Subunit: 119 residues, 3 copies
Amino acid sequence: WGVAFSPDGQTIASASDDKTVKLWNRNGQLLQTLTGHSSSVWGVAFSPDGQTIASASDDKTVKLWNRNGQLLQTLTGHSSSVWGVAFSPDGQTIASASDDKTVKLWNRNGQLLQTLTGH
Amino acid sequence: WGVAFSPDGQTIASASDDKTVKLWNRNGQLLQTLTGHSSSVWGVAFSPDGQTIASASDDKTVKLWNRNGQLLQTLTGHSSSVWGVAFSPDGQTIASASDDKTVKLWNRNGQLLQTLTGH
Amino acid sequence: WGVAFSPDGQTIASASDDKTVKLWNRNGQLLQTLTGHSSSVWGVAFSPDGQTIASASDDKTVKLWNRNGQLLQTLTGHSSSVWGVAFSPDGQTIASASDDKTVKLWNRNGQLLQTLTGH
């Protein structure tokens, strides 16, 4: 996809073609550009409370951000491009999937909890 | 996927192999065939209230329908096949994704609001 | 994906590389290994009540399991590898999708309701 809606529908996150995630309002106004990844961004997600955005990148990281664009964490450990990211329904854990078929589970404080499959 | 459940689980929408979307009840009985696309349908989605269906087609359009099968709107602007379509959680916006890596955001009345990436 | 969170976020199901589904707690600790498929597991899903897990396999079946690891049902009928499985939001139907573009709809007692497309 490369697009995610905030739970309240008021903010939309999109993976851009220039290594950023863009946040937009419902009227299609650009609100914020999230800069930090060092190659293409593939996947985006919002937390269930709507206050954190996750991004998944070809740079082999997942980054966590707030709505003001501040980088909160960089989740490092995948050995290939990360294409997918999702938050758990209670918002406390994050799953990430890389194109080498590895899935990792993290806490939001950035701790790797488990590699569910792969390396 | 090419399948979507209504939020109440009572209607199922499927992209068929014949340029249509089919609507089925929970017992697998056919309710409606949505006819109008001029080539393959790839993606389907329901609105959160369950009363509108969106379809994404190789004909480069997204169409919006009601449950009685009536065509409400055609969203034109993608320059390639549209594979994905999704409503926002509040139902007020619609994102569409084409295989040329373009994502467009529309309002619920079919107004194009923004091209989030691509052309 | 190959991963699904239970609706309450307390159990995580993942397709493993060894023909099993693994269930994990929120801390990443293994709870169960679901053994029975005779080749790779591709897709997993939870019922909306969180009490049943579905798995979709290269062995052309979907298996239904409980959180104690007991196999409850095997859904047979697809003539190719099953990659996707999903429960309806009310939990009364299951859709399965195989890589020959067939989608089947089943009830919760394992009755095939309809082949929505394909064979």
